[PDB]
């Protein structure tokens, strides 16, 4: 499990139960409403604001806790040769435990949040399964 007591600051515990807020057309799905996890950096459970920008990418690695590595591709135009060059910038985004089937090749839409780590500033808001089984 963990070492501290996982709890939401706004709501009160059981006495003698989830809080969600995303907005911007990415409201809480049915999996993150009831839920079984507790974390402060979740787009739904935690306290994170979608305020800066909206981007997209493809998840490449799932070898971290609540975080995955996406790949954001683009083409840079070189004026001299009148051509483009294939560039890509990987970003580490915070993956909420509610999202499933995000193994590899999945399209991830992210939103700019407050700095949650040394490199993480975006949170997953949409998961689109590729053409497979």
């Amino acid at each position: 499990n963990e070492r501290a007591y996982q709890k939401q600051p706004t709501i009160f515990q059981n006495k003698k139960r989830y809080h969600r807020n995303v907005g911007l057309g990415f409201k809480t799905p049915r999996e993150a409403i009831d839920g079984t996890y507790i974390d402060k950096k979740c787009p739904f459970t935690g306290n994170v604001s979608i305020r800066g920008r909206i981007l997209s990418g493809v998840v490449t690695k799932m070898k971290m806790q609540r975080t995955i590595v996406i790949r954001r591709d683009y083409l840079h135009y070189i004026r001299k040769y009148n051509r483009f060059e294939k560039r890509h910038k990987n970003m580490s985004v915070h993956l909420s435990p509610c999202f499933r089937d995000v193994t590899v090749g999945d399209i991830v839409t992210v939103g700019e949040c407050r700095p949650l780590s040394k490199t993480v500033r975006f949170n997953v808001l949409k998961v689109t399964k590729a053409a497979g089984a």
């Binding site: 911007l24 057309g25 979608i50 305020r51 909206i54």
Partner: protein, 261 residues
């Protein structure tokens, strides 16, 4: 970079002043006040360059040190007052009542006596902040603070307040069809009628303004300055509201008038 900057180079000044580059190095840095530095005009310029009533920078000091100028009826002493948009500059000693209003382009014009209209102005509200025990607040255009607002006013409407009492007399709701004077660059001074308002969740909203001759364009929601309900303005406008005569059209008027004089 250790703190606040207190100088302003002449070439770094806003273009709306038209300063002489061969007289000095620094521009008159407008004193801190109700308006942005980029959207104002130093009181020295309006008295030395626009009105030409002052010849140097020390003679314009003698204007404020004798208590003759009074923005919104209140006599000021700082020769670098912002004197932003809709700021009524009345001169009771000389009977002149100026309002710094924009031309078809972006510049500060010499709009003369508007006595029966100069007693008030128009202010764009910014936010509706709730005070204690449920008392809302409204922040107006020239930093004037008005409390106890009507529950029907929003963060985009305009209001009129008298220079003495400073109370909201009338307000103009923001919707498609209101007279407006676009502000914010490339349309500064273009007077027209609002026609549409695009919505963008999480960013700026786009609005479309149609001028008198049908010169419709687009701009951000934060660029609307409603000046009249429907198609009738409240205060007197300068020579040419929002017609925006093109380079060819301005060329025709200059040759046809000089040949007759």
């Amino acid at each position: 970079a250790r703190g606040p900057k207190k100088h302003l180079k002449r070439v770094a000044a806003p273009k709306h002043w038209m300063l002489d580059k061969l007289t000095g190095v620094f521009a008159p840095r407008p004193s801190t006040g109700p308006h942005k530095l980029r959207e104002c005009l130093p009181l020295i310029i309006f008295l030395r360059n626009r009105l030409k009533y002052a010849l140097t920078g020390d003679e314009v000091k003698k204007i404020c040190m004798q208590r003759f100028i009074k923005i919104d009826g209140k006599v000021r002493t700082d020769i670098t007052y912002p004197t932003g948009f809709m700021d009524v500059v009345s001169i009771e000693k000389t009977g002149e009542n100026f309002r710094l209003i924009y031309d078809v382009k972006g510049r500060f014009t010499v709009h003369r006596i508007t006595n029966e209209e100069a007693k008030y102005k128009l202010c764009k509200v910014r936010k509706i902040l709730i005070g204690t025990k449920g008392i809302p607040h409204l922040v107006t255009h020239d930093a004037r603070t008005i409390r106890y607002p009507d529950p029907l006013i929003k963060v985009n409407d305009t209001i009129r307040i008298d220079l003495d009492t400073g109370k909201i007399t009338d307000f103009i709701k923001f919707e498609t069809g209101n007279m407006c004077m676009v502000t914010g660059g490339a349309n500064l001074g273009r007077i027209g009628v609002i026609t549409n308002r695009e919505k963008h969740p999480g960013s700026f909203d786009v609005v479309h303004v149609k001028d008198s001759i049908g010169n419709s364009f687009a701009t951000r929601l934060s660029n609307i300055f409603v000046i009249g309900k429907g198609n009738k303005p409240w205060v007197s406008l300068p020579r040419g509201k929002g017609v925006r005569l093109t380079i060819a059209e301005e060329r025709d008027k200059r040759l046809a008038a000089k040949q007759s004089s």
